[PDB]
């Protein structure tokens, strides 16, 4: 049931293709042990808030990374104004940084290149973000 539920959620709720589902299973085996609610939420986060299409999620190995990490990186960039959510038309005024230079890179590398902020600013931001999620 656990395996069946995971693939059903990806195919039906997340509307991934059979080929894409297989690739997700091949590249991110951690999705199977992951809770269905959390996995759905993670996909929802990339698709709408981050405005990422299906092929990009699969290619960039997005579901591999923890949900916590995704929140910290994206919200920081969004609040900095460096990352802007795509509109209804899908076009952005300033092209968004790639997930390669957001999640794949280290904390230090992300701050140096993408965020363009000192570490001490980001450290204190972690605490604020962590608190915000507590009240929910």
């Amino acid at each position: 049931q656990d395996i069946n539920d995971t693939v059903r959620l990806l195919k039906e709720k997340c509307l991934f293709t059979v080929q894409q589902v297989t690739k997700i299973l091949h590249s991110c085996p951690s999705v199977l042990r992951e809770d269905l609610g959390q996995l759905e939420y993670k996909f929802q986060y990339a698709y709408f808030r981050m405005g990422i299409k299906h092929p990009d999620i699969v290619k960039s190995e997005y579901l591999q990374y923890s949900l916590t990490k995704i929140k910290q990186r994206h919200i920081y960039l969004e609040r900095l104004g460096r990352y802007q959510t795509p509109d209804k038309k899908g076009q952005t005024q300033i092209p968004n940084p790639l997930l390669k230079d957001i999640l794949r890179v280290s904390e230090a590398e992300f701050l140096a290149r993408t965020a363009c902020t000192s570490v001490e600013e980001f450290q204190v931001f972690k605490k604020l973000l962590a608190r915000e999620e507590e009240e929910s």
């Binding site: 609040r79 104004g81 363009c116 902020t117 600013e121 931001f125």
Partner: peptide
Amino acid sequence: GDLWPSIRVSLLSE
């Protein structure tokens, strides 16, 4: 200028 990002994130935060 470059100060705005820092101000922007701070304004939206608690």
